[PDB]
């Protein structure tokens, strides 16, 4: 009974699954730590409201999901199904997030 889905088939399931849901996809503490880590470099011994870390996550993730959407199109524009660094750089170059 050695049952295996072929490559790409759970990926699709996942795509369906997560587009359908709203919960945040990055684990919260690690995120929190990252915020705090980055915070330090500007001003030491800061604090955060929990709600300000959540606004930051909601924003970052949304940023990222969106960037992926555009990345995915850039993949497909080069007749690929697999997103690659260069796709992201094009997405951002066109958006004007970098030169």
């Amino acid at each position: 009974k050695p049952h295996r889905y072929r490559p790409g088939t759970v990926a699709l399931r996942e795509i369906r699954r997560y587009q359908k849901s709203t919960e945040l996809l990055i684990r919260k503490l690690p995120f929190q730590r990252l915020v705090r880590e980055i915070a330090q470099d500007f001003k030491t011994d800061l604090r955060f409201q929990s709600s300000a870390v959540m606004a930051l996550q909601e924003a970052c993730e949304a940023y990222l999901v969106g960037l992926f959407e555009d990345t995915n199109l850039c993949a497909i524009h080069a007749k690929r199904v697999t997103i690659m660094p260069k796709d992201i750089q094009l997405a951002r170059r066109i958006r004007g997030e970098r030169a």
Binding site: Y18, I26, F31, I38, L64, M84
Partner: protein, 80 residues
Amino acid sequence: RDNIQGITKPAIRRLARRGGVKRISGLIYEETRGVLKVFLENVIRDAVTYTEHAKRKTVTAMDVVYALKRQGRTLYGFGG
């Protein structure tokens, strides 16, 4: 302190799922990480700049929301 690695492969995959992405090169997980870092720097800097101008030591939702708006990435549901 290298918390950037807390942004795991799994979490990154998930995000890209929701972006309708099907297959992902191995080099992307780091590329994502950098991008994600640059975004946070730009948002947090601004946020904290609002914090330092109100002479506080505690960053507020509003600080974030006011930054995000400067950055064109306006956010609903945290006190706009």
